From Swiss-Prot, chains A, B:
Effect of D9A: In interface mutant 9; strongly decreased ability to mediate mitochondrial fusion
Localisation: Mitochondrion intermembrane space
Physiological role: Constitutes the soluble short form (S-OPA1) generated by cleavage by OMA1, which plays a central role in mitochondrial inner membrane fusion and cristae morphology. The transmembrane long form (L-OPA1) and the S-OPA1 form higher-order helical assemblies that coordinate the fusion of mitochondrial inner membranes. Inner membrane-anchored L-OPA1 molecules initiate membrane remodeling by recruiting soluble S-OPA1 to rapidly polymerize into a flexible cylindrical scaffold encaging the mitochondrial inner membrane.
Name of the protein in its database record: Dynamin-like GTPase OPA1, short form
Lineage of the organism: Eukaryota, Metazoa, Chordata, Craniata, Vertebrata
Organism: Homo sapiens
Length: 51, 51
């Protein structure tokens, strides 16, 4: 119980730092996982094929 | 055997007419099914959220 409280606060702070870095570097972008990036990449490829 | 040959030619001609209509109406667009349109629509929504 004592350990998990400390870990939860540390994890929340760590996640906040990661989010702050994302905003500072990529404020106008959206975070996507590996699968979603693959879907976005293929759609762009199809657009270039049409263009 | 005789019937399927006639049907295959008719289906090919029918598909050609549908493709010709697509080019005449939407030459610069890509045909997508119901699922793919849903994926495209949600991505546009996320873009508007960021904008």
């Amino acid at each position: 119980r004592e350990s998990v409280e400390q870990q939860a606060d540390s994890f929340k702070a760590t996640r906040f730092n990661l989010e702050t870095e994302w905003k500072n570097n990529y404020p106008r972008l959206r975070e996507l996982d590996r699968n979603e990036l693959f879907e976005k990449a293929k759609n762009e490829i199809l657009d270039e094929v049409i263009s």
